[PDB]
Design a protein around this ligand. Structure first.
Ligand code: UDP
Ligand code: UDP
Ligand code: GAL
Ligand code: GAL
Lengths: 272, 272
């Protein structure tokens, strides 16, 4: 049950003025494509706080990648879901190497030791009891700007920053029919980045279970998809359309790609 | 649980080409605004048939308005949810005046005698057992073009065709603070038409229950909102944002308003 929003004063949306004319803001299956200028975050914040939303954030830091956790977490504290309840889940082979990062109120961090990601995510019972949404990201990254509840939806993927202007034939999908991840040249909506996906816990467990099962099939058949879990995530999202798509604001590499005008904000970026 | 879509061949959506540049296609709370050119109906049809979706359509035909049922139903057979399971619910004081209209397969009609609409809709148990979505419309109308599963979502309203280009101060909301339906001059997103709303059964029962309760408050206080249930529906939708908004394609009056270029299709229209 959703209680009423309080009174709010904000600019009237005008039907005959689009927010953004330069980019596609809704997919052909009627999922929003999340760009700056498309959302009023005050409205969204109210909606999600009235539900007392808890967001879980999963990150894997194995071997040398523990070095990235400090900046990842510190910047997440500045920019990720601020004002909301957050549970970080840090999966690592080196629990003692996790940096001690000071968290804002209503935010917690759990260190989970591990001895791959799709298997490990599909923790099932724990997540269902502890968070409403799961966000699953790469660690070798930093938050530079707002990443908030505008992303939350039952199932989301993120446009890969090297391919958002590309034609589908250029996408680096798995092209061998012998792989579970195969996508023919005349199929595909988008090329999604494996380093930023999420959803409700139920939908994320469905995705990760399906990808893990497909990866095990491929292993048994002696085939490894071209881009590993990202190829399988692409297959899944072709066949199970996401209910929002995040623009490349949400997964960028400034060194490789610069700061194009169509990106008003660079929110989550690769570390050099 | 949602099974995988089959393989499909269709045009690639391109991120750097918008469908429509002339109109707002997503609200600031990230709900799609449904216009022609925003959706691939083949994708949507597949999604909703894989769930074996049933749509209920409610219409009231009291007193002289029974004369409108023939054209309403016949045109609904040509254009409303064709291919999907449909249950029409015709609420009337004259069961014997309901015309005998030939229905396509998978479509049924129930005549419900009545001795107002919000009360009557909030049939609760019946609808929960028999349909997935409810669509609630005026009878003095005809389908001229496709109205399909692109409208379906937990909660939708429709832009009133006299006000989609208007500023909020011009909207004919209830402006007396003594009414439950009151909306100040500096609030409002849109002016929704009371003759076309819908949603999941749960959400429609929430809306109609809330509006009926608010109307009873007003009655007890000796006040009748300016536009009756439509004023209350407006209040509700301001405080409970719809998860899709239908463009005025979906509720038009060609005699009063013509055929403007921004309307590519005239789907559901007033009868002269
Ligand atoms: O030795 C490794 C390799 C990978 N990863 C985790 O797997 C993610 C995906 O790998 P990586 O970021 O290297 O892929 P890339 O972005 O270089 O193609 C990493 O961000 C970490 O989050 C890790 O923890 N340790
Ligand atoms: O005598 C009446 C008056 C109203 N209605 C039902 O109430 C709807 C709303 O009234 P109406 O369509 O007259 O409102 P309008 O569009 O003229 O402002 C009608 O479409 C019917 O669907 C009816 O059945 N009989
Ligand atoms: O072609 C797909 C690849 O594109 C690269 O830019 C990225 O570093 C890889 O992880 C993979 O996503
Ligand atoms: O101002 C609101 C009104 O606008 C009219 O055009 C319509 O006939 C009425 O039913 C009501 O919606």
């Amino acid at each position: 049950f959703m209680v009423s929003l309080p009174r709010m004063v904000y600019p009237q949306p005008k039907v005959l003025t689009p927010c953004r004319k330069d980019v596609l803001v809704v997919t052909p299956w009627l999922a929003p494509i999340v760009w700056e200028g498309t959302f009023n975050i005050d409205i969204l914040n109210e909606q999600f706080r009235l539900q007392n939303t808890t967001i879980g954030l999963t990150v894997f830091a194995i071997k040398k990648y523990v070095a990235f956790l400090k900046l990842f977490l510190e910047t997440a504290e500045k920019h990720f879901m601020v004002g909301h309840r957050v549970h970080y889940y840090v999966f690592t082979d080196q629990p003692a190497a996790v940096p001690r990062v000071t968290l804002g109120t209503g935010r917690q961090l759990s260190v989970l030791e591990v001895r791959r990601r799709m298997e490990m995510i599909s923790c099932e019972r724990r997540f269902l009891s502890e968070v409403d949404y799961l966000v699953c990201v790469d660690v070798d990254m930093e938050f530079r700007d707002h990443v908030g509840v505008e992303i939350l939806t039952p199932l989301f993927g993120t446009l890969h920053p090297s391919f958002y202007g590309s034609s589908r034939e250029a996408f680096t999908y798995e092209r061998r029919p012998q792989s579970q991840a195969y996508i023919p040249k005349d199929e595909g909506d988008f090329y999604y980045m494996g380093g930023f996906f999420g959803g409700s816990v139920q939908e994320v467990q469905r995705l990760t279970r399906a990808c893990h099962q497909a990866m095990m099939v491929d292993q048994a058949n002696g085939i490894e998809a071209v881009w590993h879990d990202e190829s399988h995530l692409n297959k899944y999202l072709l066949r199970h359309k996401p209910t929002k798509v995040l623009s490349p604001e949400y997964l960028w590499d400034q060194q490789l790609l610069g700061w194009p005008a169509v990106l008003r904000k660079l929110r989550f970026t690769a570390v050099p």
